[PDB]
Amino acid sequence: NLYNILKEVTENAGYKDPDRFWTNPNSPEALQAKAIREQKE
Amino acid sequence: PMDDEQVLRHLDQLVNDALDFNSSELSKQRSEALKYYFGEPFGNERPGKSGIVSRDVQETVDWIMPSLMKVFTSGGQVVKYEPDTAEDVEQAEQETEYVNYLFMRKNEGFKVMFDWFQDTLMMKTGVVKVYVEEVLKPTFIRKDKKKREIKVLCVKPENFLVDRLATCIDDARFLCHREKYTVSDLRLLGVPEDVIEEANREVWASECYTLLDVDGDGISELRRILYVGDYIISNEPWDCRPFADLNAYRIAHKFHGMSVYDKIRDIQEIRSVLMRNIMDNIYRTNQGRSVVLDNSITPLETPQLSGEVYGMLDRLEADRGKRTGITDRTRGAAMSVNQLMTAAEQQIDLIARMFAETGVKRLFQLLHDHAIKYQNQEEVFQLRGKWVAVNPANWRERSDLTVTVGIGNMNKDQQMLHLMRIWEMAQAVVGGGGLGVLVSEQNLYNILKEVTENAGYKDPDRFWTNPNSPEALQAKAIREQKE
Amino acid sequence: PMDDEQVLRHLDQLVNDALDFNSSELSKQRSEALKYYFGEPFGNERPGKSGIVSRDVQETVDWIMPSLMKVFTSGGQVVKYEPDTAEDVEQAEQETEYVNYLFMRKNEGFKVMFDWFQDTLMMKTGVVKVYVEEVLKPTFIRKDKKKREIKVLCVKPENFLVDRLATCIDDARFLCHREKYTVSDLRLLGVPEDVIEEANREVWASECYTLLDVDGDGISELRRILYVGDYIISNEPWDCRPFADLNAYRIAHKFHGMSVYDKIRDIQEIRSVLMRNIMDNIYRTNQGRSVVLDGQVNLEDLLTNEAAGIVRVKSMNSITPLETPQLSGEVYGMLDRLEADRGKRTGITDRTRGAAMSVNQLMTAAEQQIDLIARMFAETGVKRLFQLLHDHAIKYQNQEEVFQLRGKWVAVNPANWRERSDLTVTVGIGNMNKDQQMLHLMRIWEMAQAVVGGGGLGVLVSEQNLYNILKEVTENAGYKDPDRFWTNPNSPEALQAKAIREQKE
Amino acid sequence: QETEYVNYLFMRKNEGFKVMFDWFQDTLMMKTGVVKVYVEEVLKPTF
């Protein structure tokens, strides 16, 4: 939801979906962008 | 049905009607516009007294045109095609650069659009003609054979007689365009004779776009008729009319457009008359009104004019602002965001939105003219390589919303807000999350990109792509995870 | 068809028409322009009173010119060719340097360009002539023979007779340019005789560019005719007309363009008339308006100006001295209003230059229209650049370039690319050096610190491209290639600087 | 999804905006802003 929090800014900046995709919900990125990267370091 | 000569006389009659009506009304209107702009005496200036005419609309044009050229003449990013998602890089931006790189740096740059603005604002209507020609000098290595070109020119809409019953570009049932096409063109066509009207025969020509029923059938196409002087014509099943017929204010349902002259003429008249009257009264006070006989003497004193009278001159200037360029001044925490909202929501940018929409039609016209057949030439579109654009997909839609008072975040504010917000946000990301964990170096590429393009260099100067490649294999794989 | 003499009379008739029309109209326009500019009295100034003309357009021209010299007299980056991508370093910038290094530092400098600017703004039509000559002084080592040159001169468009029905450079069917070409040139050509018009025969000459049919064929090319005095002419098939016909404002569909004079003449008139009226009224108040009669004050009070101060009526001092009305100082504020209008008309900065440092030098001194005029001037000069590029790509010489390095082949076989790009020169993308460089500097430095922190040194933009990154700074500092070489691309300096000096240590 | 469908068919596929501009005009000087919605078809198949 920091995703969505920065999103409201991004949409307010005129670019909603693609420019700051940022999604990282639960995905090949999120497995290494929310668990592998942080909990292993 | 089966009309080959009654079409000629019908076109002649329609030419006569367009002549009478368009000529009288619009010529008188645009002539009044020209007289007011050029600042000549209006005719009420009696001899022996100052014919002071203060040009007031000229500085207004000087005000509006530069903003117009920033918004238009700024890169080649005004009009995208907005296709479906997949087939954008294929042709949307590709054919976009094709048409614009043929439109900038290959079609006169902006000068014709400049005169188009002027024609809609002074001459009351901005309209141009798009047509084609050829290229020459082959190998006689240098194989320049049958190369086709498509190009546009101002028509001097006084040479664009048309029925008033259109109100839109795709509504003129009778498009009449006037030209000279003198003896050289006559010989090139092959006409052996002439008309009543020496290579300087100053002959005149007319082109007609009109749809009829000349085949004993249903609704036939438009027809292009080279009715010159009731002589050898060049008729053709005609598909697209290459014109744009601006109006300069996007006025209500009428074809010819109310000119910026039409609404600043009163202001100009008031200004010139007031200053002339005040200086005339100053002259009257200076010369003296003394009763002479044919020495009692009854010298009356001419009433002097208080100094407040010129405050309404400043008021008139503020109105001339607040009429259209509502910032009376040059530009009427938070740094006055977006340059004080693009200089206080300027109506000029609204007329710019309308103009961009008008030029959307022109872009589709040219995209047709080249997607039928133009040439096989590539693009210097940030890189080498482009196939023949005689078989693109027109997409039937041209997107130019990012140009005007709408979302339209302008570069000197778009880029500054972008850089500030993205930099603070991304540095917090690096501190808290990291680089590639959140929006990655591959999209930090695009993140820096927006700045790069806003700085004027789009693709090559800051390549930064590093997507998945020899630069990426050592730049996103081994440089960081093996160190 | 087979016209070798009727061409002469047709050209003479066109000369006469150009004379009458162009001379009358445009000469009167430029003459009134000069009368206003030089600040001499307009002719309405009666004797016995000050014909003071407050010069207003002169300082205006002084205002407009210097920016034009900044934008013009700035490096060799004014016009690029923009060819297909690969063939840029081959000829594009190479031939650009050739033509400009000949254009600048080898073609008179910009005094011709300055006078072009004046001619379009002051003499109302900026146009010049480009032609060729030869070189001399051989070994008589020193082999200097038959070298061909191309050079430009002001035409003094009073000596550039042309029909008004052109409105464009490639539309004049009759280009008549006037010169003197005195007895020396007559001898050099070889004409044995003279005309009506002692080596001071002050003979006058004319050159015509015009196309017709003289062969009984299709539309023939242009022809260059040395119609001098109905004497030996030098006719030739003609391909290029070397002129530019500026108009100072890119005016609408008319050839001769309205001048800066044509729009500041009113400002100057109003200013001078009002100030002269004010000072005349001040003089009237100072001298005093006292009604004198006949019989008494036979000496007319010595015009109320001598060093006596005695009325000396005779017997009566009734006297009706009316007080001359005073002029309030609020009119002086209208002088400031006039100055602001004179600015806001073209040089819309009322002052010398009317957090984020007022980005781009306050948007280039508040979106100055003078840069607009610069853009359309530069577009006009593109045509001149292509003309000279022709003149040298046909045949100029085999000489090299001093282009930041040694080496350049013969520029008599370039590819003209048919296009000259000068977009970055004006109000457009046009990121100007004193702002382009600074924004580039700040953005690169912040980008680079972030990249070093997160990405690294060569992982992102690398020392070869960080080299070009440093370059933009270098070129913006005025020294482009040689001062900061830094290239280090793949080379002996790259072998010990980008190959072995980091991974092995 | 349908919101984007209708708006994208409405902006950039129904002429963009201009109409409601006229709408405003139609109710500011023309005193009554009103427009008509109808249907048509498309042609040029594989031939």
mmCIF file with all atom_site columns, N, CA and C in Angstrom, chain B residues 55 59 62 69-70 75 101 111 114 184 295 304 307 380 383-384 423 441 451-452 455 457 461-464 475 479-480, chain C residues 82-87 219 250 265 293 325 330 345 367 369 429 431 443 446 449-451 455 459-461 465 469 472:
data_model
loop_
_atom_site.group_PDB
_atom_site.id
_atom_site.type_symbol
_atom_site.label_atom_id
_atom_site.label_alt_id
_atom_site.label_comp_id
_atom_site.label_asym_id
_atom_site.label_entity_id
_atom_site.label_seq_id
_atom_site.pdbx_PDB_ins_code
_atom_site.Cartn_x
_atom_site.Cartn_y
_atom_site.Cartn_z
_atom_site.occupancy
_atom_site.B_iso_or_equiv
_atom_site.pdbx_formal_charge
_atom_site.auth_seq_id
_atom_site.auth_comp_id
_atom_site.auth_asym_id
_atom_site.auth_atom_id
_atom_site.pdbx_PDB_model_num
ATOM 1   N N  . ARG B 1 55  ? -2.211  51.362 -33.158 1.00 0.00 ? 55  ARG B N  1
ATOM 2   C CA . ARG B 1 55  ? -2.336  49.927 -33.358 1.00 0.00 ? 55  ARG B CA 1
ATOM 3   C C  . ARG B 1 55  ? -2.430  49.237 -32.005 1.00 0.00 ? 55  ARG B C  1
ATOM 4   N N  . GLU B 1 59  ? -0.009  44.482 -31.105 1.00 0.00 ? 59  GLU B N  1
ATOM 5   C CA . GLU B 1 59  ? 0.673   43.997 -29.914 1.00 0.00 ? 59  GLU B CA 1
ATOM 6   C C  . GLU B 1 59  ? -0.034  42.784 -29.337 1.00 0.00 ? 59  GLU B C  1
ATOM 7   N N  . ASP B 1 62  ? 1.335   40.007 -31.198 1.00 0.00 ? 62  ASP B N  1
ATOM 8   C CA . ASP B 1 62  ? 2.667   39.821 -30.644 1.00 0.00 ? 62  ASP B CA 1
ATOM 9   C C  . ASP B 1 62  ? 2.618   39.106 -29.309 1.00 0.00 ? 62  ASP B C  1
ATOM 10  N N  . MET B 1 69  ? 3.735   29.434 -30.373 1.00 0.00 ? 69  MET B N  1
ATOM 11  C CA . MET B 1 69  ? 4.841   28.664 -30.914 1.00 0.00 ? 69  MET B CA 1
ATOM 12  C C  . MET B 1 69  ? 5.554   27.842 -29.843 1.00 0.00 ? 69  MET B C  1
ATOM 13  N N  . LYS B 1 70  ? 5.580   28.281 -28.578 1.00 0.00 ? 70  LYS B N  1
ATOM 14  C CA . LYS B 1 70  ? 6.046   27.341 -27.558 1.00 0.00 ? 70  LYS B CA 1
ATOM 15  C C  . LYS B 1 70  ? 5.206   26.084 -27.579 1.00 0.00 ? 70  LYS B C  1
ATOM 16  N N  . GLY B 1 75  ? 9.631   20.405 -29.945 1.00 0.00 ? 75  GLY B N  1
ATOM 17  C CA . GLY B 1 75  ? 9.820   19.003 -30.233 1.00 0.00 ? 75  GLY B CA 1
ATOM 18  C C  . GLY B 1 75  ? 8.776   18.484 -31.208 1.00 0.00 ? 75  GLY B C  1
ATOM 19  N N  . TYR B 1 101 ? 8.531   14.371 -38.697 1.00 0.00 ? 101 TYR B N  1
ATOM 20  C CA . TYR B 1 101 ? 9.807   14.597 -39.343 1.00 0.00 ? 101 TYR B CA 1
ATOM 21  C C  . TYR B 1 101 ? 9.645   14.911 -40.818 1.00 0.00 ? 101 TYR B C  1
ATOM 22  N N  . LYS B 1 111 ? 6.174   27.685 -40.374 1.00 0.00 ? 111 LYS B N  1
ATOM 23  C CA . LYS B 1 111 ? 5.816   28.965 -40.979 1.00 0.00 ? 111 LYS B CA 1
ATOM 24  C C  . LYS B 1 111 ? 4.399   28.946 -41.536 1.00 0.00 ? 111 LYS B C  1
ATOM 25  N N  . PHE B 1 114 ? 2.153   29.197 -38.767 1.00 0.00 ? 114 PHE B N  1
ATOM 26  C CA . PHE B 1 114 ? 2.171   30.594 -38.363 1.00 0.00 ? 114 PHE B CA 1
ATOM 27  C C  . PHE B 1 114 ? 1.191   31.441 -39.170 1.00 0.00 ? 114 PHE B C  1
ATOM 28  N N  . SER B 1 184 ? 3.378   28.085 -68.069 1.00 0.00 ? 184 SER B N  1
ATOM 29  C CA . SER B 1 184 ? 4.231   26.923 -67.844 1.00 0.00 ? 184 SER B CA 1
ATOM 30  C C  . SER B 1 184 ? 3.401   25.715 -67.435 1.00 0.00 ? 184 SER B C  1
ATOM 31  N N  . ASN B 1 295 ? -10.104 97.054 -29.264 1.00 0.00 ? 295 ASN B N  1
ATOM 32  C CA . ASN B 1 295 ? -9.694  95.723 -28.832 1.00 0.00 ? 295 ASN B CA 1
ATOM 33  C C  . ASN B 1 295 ? -10.490 95.259 -27.622 1.00 0.00 ? 295 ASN B C  1
ATOM 34  N N  . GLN B 1 304 ? -9.246  72.469 -20.086 1.00 0.00 ? 304 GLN B N  1
ATOM 35  C CA . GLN B 1 304 ? -8.148  71.521 -20.069 1.00 0.00 ? 304 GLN B CA 1
ATOM 36  C C  . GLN B 1 304 ? -8.634  70.157 -19.590 1.00 0.00 ? 304 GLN B C  1
ATOM 37  N N  . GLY B 1 307 ? -5.495  64.905 -15.628 1.00 0.00 ? 307 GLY B N  1
ATOM 38  C CA . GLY B 1 307 ? -4.544  63.837 -15.844 1.00 0.00 ? 307 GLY B CA 1
ATOM 39  C C  . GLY B 1 307 ? -5.077  62.442 -15.623 1.00 0.00 ? 307 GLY B C  1
ATOM 40  N N  . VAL B 1 380 ? 15.085  9.089  -39.365 1.00 0.00 ? 380 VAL B N  1
ATOM 41  C CA . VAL B 1 380 ? 16.289  9.384  -38.602 1.00 0.00 ? 380 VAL B CA 1
ATOM 42  C C  . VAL B 1 380 ? 15.759  9.478  -37.177 1.00 0.00 ? 380 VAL B C  1
ATOM 43  N N  . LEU B 1 383 ? 17.414  6.944  -34.401 1.00 0.00 ? 383 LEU B N  1
ATOM 44  C CA . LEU B 1 383 ? 18.094  5.712  -34.758 1.00 0.00 ? 383 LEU B CA 1
ATOM 45  C C  . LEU B 1 383 ? 17.909  5.491  -36.249 1.00 0.00 ? 383 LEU B C  1
ATOM 46  N N  . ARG B 1 384 ? 18.713  4.587  -36.789 1.00 0.00 ? 384 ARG B N  1
ATOM 47  C CA . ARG B 1 384 ? 18.632  4.246  -38.198 1.00 0.00 ? 384 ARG B CA 1
ATOM 48  C C  . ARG B 1 384 ? 17.585  3.162  -38.409 1.00 0.00 ? 384 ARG B C  1
ATOM 49  N N  . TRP B 1 423 ? 12.531  12.532 -7.322  1.00 0.00 ? 423 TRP B N  1
ATOM 50  C CA . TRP B 1 423 ? 13.805  12.454 -6.634  1.00 0.00 ? 423 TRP B CA 1
ATOM 51  C C  . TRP B 1 423 ? 13.603  12.227 -5.146  1.00 0.00 ? 423 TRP B C  1
ATOM 52  N N  . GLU B 1 441 ? 16.182  -0.474 -11.527 1.00 0.00 ? 441 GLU B N  1
ATOM 53  C CA . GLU B 1 441 ? 17.118  0.223  -12.401 1.00 0.00 ? 441 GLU B CA 1
ATOM 54  C C  . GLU B 1 441 ? 16.674  0.131  -13.850 1.00 0.00 ? 441 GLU B C  1
ATOM 55  N N  . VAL B 1 451 ? 13.061  12.875 -17.308 1.00 0.00 ? 451 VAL B N  1
ATOM 56  C CA . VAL B 1 451 ? 13.960  14.016 -17.203 1.00 0.00 ? 451 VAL B CA 1
ATOM 57  C C  . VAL B 1 451 ? 14.742  14.201 -18.497 1.00 0.00 ? 451 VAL B C  1
ATOM 58  N N  . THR B 1 452 ? 15.260  13.105 -19.063 1.00 0.00 ? 452 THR B N  1
ATOM 59  C CA . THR B 1 452 ? 16.080  13.219 -20.268 1.00 0.00 ? 452 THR B CA 1
ATOM 60  C C  . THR B 1 452 ? 15.281  13.818 -21.417 1.00 0.00 ? 452 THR B C  1
ATOM 61  N N  . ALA B 1 455 ? 14.567  17.313 -21.033 1.00 0.00 ? 455 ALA B N  1
ATOM 62  C CA . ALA B 1 455 ? 15.747  18.107 -21.320 1.00 0.00 ? 455 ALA B CA 1
ATOM 63  C C  . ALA B 1 455 ? 16.013  18.238 -22.814 1.00 0.00 ? 455 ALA B C  1
ATOM 64  N N  . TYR B 1 457 ? 16.718  15.789 -25.208 1.00 0.00 ? 457 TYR B N  1
ATOM 65  C CA . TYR B 1 457 ? 17.326  14.615 -25.822 1.00 0.00 ? 457 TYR B CA 1
ATOM 66  C C  . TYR B 1 457 ? 16.564  13.387 -25.348 1.00 0.00 ? 457 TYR B C  1
ATOM 67  N N  . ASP B 1 461 ? 21.081  10.453 -26.225 1.00 0.00 ? 461 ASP B N  1
ATOM 68  C CA . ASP B 1 461 ? 22.001  11.105 -25.297 1.00 0.00 ? 461 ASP B CA 1
ATOM 69  C C  . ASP B 1 461 ? 22.102  10.333 -23.994 1.00 0.00 ? 461 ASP B C  1
ATOM 70  N N  . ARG B 1 462 ? 20.965  10.015 -23.389 1.00 0.00 ? 462 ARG B N  1
ATOM 71  C CA . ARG B 1 462 ? 20.923  9.197  -22.188 1.00 0.00 ? 462 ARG B CA 1
ATOM 72  C C  . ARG B 1 462 ? 20.205  7.911  -22.575 1.00 0.00 ? 462 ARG B C  1
ATOM 73  N N  . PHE B 1 463 ? 20.968  6.952  -23.101 1.00 0.00 ? 463 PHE B N  1
ATOM 74  C CA . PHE B 1 463 ? 20.384  5.696  -23.547 1.00 0.00 ? 463 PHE B CA 1
ATOM 75  C C  . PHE B 1 463 ? 19.779  4.979  -22.347 1.00 0.00 ? 463 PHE B C  1
ATOM 76  N N  . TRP B 1 464 ? 20.612  4.642  -21.364 1.00 0.00 ? 464 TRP B N  1
ATOM 77  C CA . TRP B 1 464 ? 20.250  4.136  -20.045 1.00 0.00 ? 464 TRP B CA 1
ATOM 78  C C  . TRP B 1 464 ? 19.388  2.888  -20.093 1.00 0.00 ? 464 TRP B C  1
ATOM 79  N N  . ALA B 1 475 ? 25.680  -5.415 -15.864 1.00 0.00 ? 475 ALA B N  1
ATOM 80  C CA . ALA B 1 475 ? 25.190  -4.220 -15.203 1.00 0.00 ? 475 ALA B CA 1
ATOM 81  C C  . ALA B 1 475 ? 24.009  -4.490 -14.287 1.00 0.00 ? 475 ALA B C  1
ATOM 82  N N  . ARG B 1 479 ? 27.534  -7.322 -11.596 1.00 0.00 ? 479 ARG B N  1
ATOM 83  C CA . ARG B 1 479 ? 28.172  -6.180 -10.956 1.00 0.00 ? 479 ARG B CA 1
ATOM 84  C C  . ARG B 1 479 ? 27.712  -5.987 -9.524  1.00 0.00 ? 479 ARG B C  1
ATOM 85  N N  . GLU B 1 480 ? 26.553  -6.529 -9.165  1.00 0.00 ? 480 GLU B N  1
ATOM 86  C CA . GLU B 1 480 ? 25.929  -6.255 -7.879  1.00 0.00 ? 480 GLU B CA 1
ATOM 87  C C  . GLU B 1 480 ? 25.696  -7.511 -7.058  1.00 0.00 ? 480 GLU B C  1
ATOM 88  N N  . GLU C 2 82  ? 21.445  17.270 -40.048 1.00 0.00 ? 82  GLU C N  1
ATOM 89  C CA . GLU C 2 82  ? 20.484  16.221 -39.724 1.00 0.00 ? 82  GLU C CA 1
ATOM 90  C C  . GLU C 2 82  ? 20.291  15.235 -40.873 1.00 0.00 ? 82  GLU C C  1
ATOM 91  N N  . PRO C 2 83  ? 21.327  14.531 -41.293 1.00 0.00 ? 83  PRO C N  1
ATOM 92  C CA . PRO C 2 83  ? 21.142  13.498 -42.312 1.00 0.00 ? 83  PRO C CA 1
ATOM 93  C C  . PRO C 2 83  ? 20.727  12.183 -41.685 1.00 0.00 ? 83  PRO C C  1
ATOM 94  N N  . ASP C 2 84  ? 20.699  11.127 -42.490 1.00 0.00 ? 84  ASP C N  1
ATOM 95  C CA . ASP C 2 84  ? 20.543  9.788  -41.949 1.00 0.00 ? 84  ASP C CA 1
ATOM 96  C C  . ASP C 2 84  ? 21.619  9.521  -40.903 1.00 0.00 ? 84  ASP C C  1
ATOM 97  N N  . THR C 2 85  ? 21.272  8.683  -39.924 1.00 0.00 ? 85  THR C N  1
ATOM 98  C CA . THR C 2 85  ? 22.017  8.649  -38.669 1.00 0.00 ? 85  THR C CA 1
ATOM 99  C C  . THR C 2 85  ? 23.484  8.293  -38.865 1.00 0.00 ? 85  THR C C  1
ATOM 100 N N  . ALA C 2 86  ? 23.779  7.266  -39.663 1.00 0.00 ? 86  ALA C N  1
ATOM 101 C CA . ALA C 2 86  ? 25.155  6.789  -39.766 1.00 0.00 ? 86  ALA C CA 1
ATOM 102 C C  . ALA C 2 86  ? 26.072  7.858  -40.345 1.00 0.00 ? 86  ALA C C  1
ATOM 103 N N  . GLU C 2 87  ? 25.606  8.569  -41.369 1.00 0.00 ? 87  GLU C N  1
ATOM 104 C CA . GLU C 2 87  ? 26.469  9.454  -42.150 1.00 0.00 ? 87  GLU C CA 1
ATOM 105 C C  . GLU C 2 87  ? 26.409  10.876 -41.594 1.00 0.00 ? 87  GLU C C  1
ATOM 106 N N  . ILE C 2 219 ? 9.803   24.570 -70.879 1.00 0.00 ? 219 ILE C N  1
ATOM 107 C CA . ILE C 2 219 ? 10.160  25.593 -69.903 1.00 0.00 ? 219 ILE C CA 1
ATOM 108 C C  . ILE C 2 219 ? 11.661  25.499 -69.648 1.00 0.00 ? 219 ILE C C  1
ATOM 109 N N  . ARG C 2 250 ? 8.676   38.281 -40.660 1.00 0.00 ? 250 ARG C N  1
ATOM 110 C CA . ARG C 2 250 ? 7.976   37.160 -41.285 1.00 0.00 ? 250 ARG C CA 1
ATOM 111 C C  . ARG C 2 250 ? 6.505   37.508 -41.512 1.00 0.00 ? 250 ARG C C  1
ATOM 112 N N  . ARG C 2 265 ? 7.643   53.825 -35.294 1.00 0.00 ? 265 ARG C N  1
ATOM 113 C CA . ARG C 2 265 ? 7.541   55.206 -35.741 1.00 0.00 ? 265 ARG C CA 1
ATOM 114 C C  . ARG C 2 265 ? 6.466   55.951 -34.969 1.00 0.00 ? 265 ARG C C  1
ATOM 115 N N  . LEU C 2 293 ? -0.665  96.155 -26.238 1.00 0.00 ? 293 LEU C N  1
ATOM 116 C CA . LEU C 2 293 ? -1.551  96.877 -27.134 1.00 0.00 ? 293 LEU C CA 1
ATOM 117 C C  . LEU C 2 293 ? -0.712  97.619 -28.171 1.00 0.00 ? 293 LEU C C  1
ATOM 118 N N  . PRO C 2 325 ? -1.312  78.140 -18.785 1.00 0.00 ? 325 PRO C N  1
ATOM 119 C CA . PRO C 2 325 ? -1.650  76.980 -17.951 1.00 0.00 ? 325 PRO C CA 1
ATOM 120 C C  . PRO C 2 325 ? -0.447  76.074 -17.741 1.00 0.00 ? 325 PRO C C  1
ATOM 121 N N  . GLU C 2 330 ? 2.109   64.311 -14.327 1.00 0.00 ? 330 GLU C N  1
ATOM 122 C CA . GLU C 2 330 ? 1.537   63.008 -14.649 1.00 0.00 ? 330 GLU C CA 1
ATOM 123 C C  . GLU C 2 330 ? 1.783   62.626 -16.102 1.00 0.00 ? 330 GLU C C  1
ATOM 124 N N  . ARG C 2 345 ? 6.010   45.899 -27.142 1.00 0.00 ? 345 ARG C N  1
ATOM 125 C CA . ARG C 2 345 ? 5.678   45.645 -28.536 1.00 0.00 ? 345 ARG C CA 1
ATOM 126 C C  . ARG C 2 345 ? 6.532   44.510 -29.087 1.00 0.00 ? 345 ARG C C  1
ATOM 127 N N  . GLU C 2 367 ? 10.081  35.209 -22.416 1.00 0.00 ? 367 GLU C N  1
ATOM 128 C CA . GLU C 2 367 ? 9.672   34.731 -23.746 1.00 0.00 ? 367 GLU C CA 1
ATOM 129 C C  . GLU C 2 367 ? 9.780   35.823 -24.810 1.00 0.00 ? 367 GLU C C  1
ATOM 130 N N  . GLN C 2 369 ? 10.146  37.985 -27.953 1.00 0.00 ? 369 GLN C N  1
ATOM 131 C CA . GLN C 2 369 ? 9.798   37.873 -29.365 1.00 0.00 ? 369 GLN C CA 1
ATOM 132 C C  . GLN C 2 369 ? 11.006  38.071 -30.268 1.00 0.00 ? 369 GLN C C  1
ATOM 133 N N  . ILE C 2 429 ? 12.869  23.777 -28.429 1.00 0.00 ? 429 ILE C N  1
ATOM 134 C CA . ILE C 2 429 ? 13.603  22.973 -27.448 1.00 0.00 ? 429 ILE C CA 1
ATOM 135 C C  . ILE C 2 429 ? 14.815  23.753 -26.959 1.00 0.00 ? 429 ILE C C  1
ATOM 136 N N  . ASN C 2 431 ? 17.471  24.627 -25.684 1.00 0.00 ? 431 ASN C N  1
ATOM 137 C CA . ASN C 2 431 ? 18.061  24.799 -24.362 1.00 0.00 ? 431 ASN C CA 1
ATOM 138 C C  . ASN C 2 431 ? 19.360  25.582 -24.510 1.00 0.00 ? 431 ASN C C  1
ATOM 139 N N  . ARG C 2 443 ? 21.517  18.298 -13.112 1.00 0.00 ? 443 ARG C N  1
ATOM 140 C CA . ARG C 2 443 ? 20.826  17.025 -13.268 1.00 0.00 ? 443 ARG C CA 1
ATOM 141 C C  . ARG C 2 443 ? 21.818  15.877 -13.367 1.00 0.00 ? 443 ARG C C  1
ATOM 142 N N  . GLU C 2 446 ? 23.419  15.285 -9.694  1.00 0.00 ? 446 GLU C N  1
ATOM 143 C CA . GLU C 2 446 ? 22.507  14.525 -8.842  1.00 0.00 ? 446 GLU C CA 1
ATOM 144 C C  . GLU C 2 446 ? 22.280  13.103 -9.364  1.00 0.00 ? 446 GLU C C  1
ATOM 145 N N  . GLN C 2 449 ? 25.575  11.070 -8.577  1.00 0.00 ? 449 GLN C N  1
ATOM 146 C CA . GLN C 2 449 ? 25.702  10.669 -7.183  1.00 0.00 ? 449 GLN C CA 1
ATOM 147 C C  . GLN C 2 449 ? 24.727  9.547  -6.852  1.00 0.00 ? 449 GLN C C  1
ATOM 148 N N  . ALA C 2 450 ? 23.487  9.637  -7.343  1.00 0.00 ? 450 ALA C N  1
ATOM 149 C CA . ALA C 2 450 ? 22.542  8.565  -7.052  1.00 0.00 ? 450 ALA C CA 1
ATOM 150 C C  . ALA C 2 450 ? 22.968  7.258  -7.705  1.00 0.00 ? 450 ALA C C  1
ATOM 151 N N  . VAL C 2 451 ? 23.504  7.329  -8.922  1.00 0.00 ? 451 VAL C N  1
ATOM 152 C CA . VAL C 2 451 ? 23.896  6.117  -9.635  1.00 0.00 ? 451 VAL C CA 1
ATOM 153 C C  . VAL C 2 451 ? 25.084  5.464  -8.951  1.00 0.00 ? 451 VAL C C  1
ATOM 154 N N  . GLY C 2 455 ? 23.661  2.233  -8.320  1.00 0.00 ? 455 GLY C N  1
ATOM 155 C CA . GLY C 2 455 ? 24.141  1.416  -9.415  1.00 0.00 ? 455 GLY C CA 1
ATOM 156 C C  . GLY C 2 455 ? 25.635  1.181  -9.372  1.00 0.00 ? 455 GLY C C  1
ATOM 157 N N  . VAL C 2 459 ? 28.456  0.474  -14.495 1.00 0.00 ? 459 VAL C N  1
ATOM 158 C CA . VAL C 2 459 ? 27.231  -0.309 -14.620 1.00 0.00 ? 459 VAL C CA 1
ATOM 159 C C  . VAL C 2 459 ? 26.166  0.458  -15.396 1.00 0.00 ? 459 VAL C C  1
ATOM 160 N N  . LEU C 2 460 ? 25.890  1.683  -14.981 1.00 0.00 ? 460 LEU C N  1
ATOM 161 C CA . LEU C 2 460 ? 25.040  2.604  -15.714 1.00 0.00 ? 460 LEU C CA 1
ATOM 162 C C  . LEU C 2 460 ? 25.944  3.336  -16.703 1.00 0.00 ? 460 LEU C C  1
ATOM 163 N N  . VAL C 2 461 ? 25.507  4.496  -17.192 1.00 0.00 ? 461 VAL C N  1
ATOM 164 C CA . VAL C 2 461 ? 26.281  5.292  -18.143 1.00 0.00 ? 461 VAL C CA 1
ATOM 165 C C  . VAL C 2 461 ? 27.759  5.289  -17.764 1.00 0.00 ? 461 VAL C C  1
ATOM 166 N N  . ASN C 2 465 ? 30.549  6.999  -22.066 1.00 0.00 ? 465 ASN C N  1
ATOM 167 C CA . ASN C 2 465 ? 29.394  7.875  -22.158 1.00 0.00 ? 465 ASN C CA 1
ATOM 168 C C  . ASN C 2 465 ? 29.374  8.932  -21.065 1.00 0.00 ? 465 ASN C C  1
ATOM 169 N N  . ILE C 2 469 ? 29.035  12.854 -21.413 1.00 0.00 ? 469 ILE C N  1
ATOM 170 C CA . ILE C 2 469 ? 28.338  13.620 -20.390 1.00 0.00 ? 469 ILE C CA 1
ATOM 171 C C  . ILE C 2 469 ? 29.177  14.808 -19.944 1.00 0.00 ? 469 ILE C C  1
ATOM 172 N N  . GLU C 2 472 ? 29.276  17.571 -22.821 1.00 0.00 ? 472 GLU C N  1
ATOM 173 C CA . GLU C 2 472 ? 28.305  18.671 -22.947 1.00 0.00 ? 472 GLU C CA 1
ATOM 174 C C  . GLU C 2 472 ? 28.762  19.871 -22.145 1.00 0.00 ? 472 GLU C C  1
#
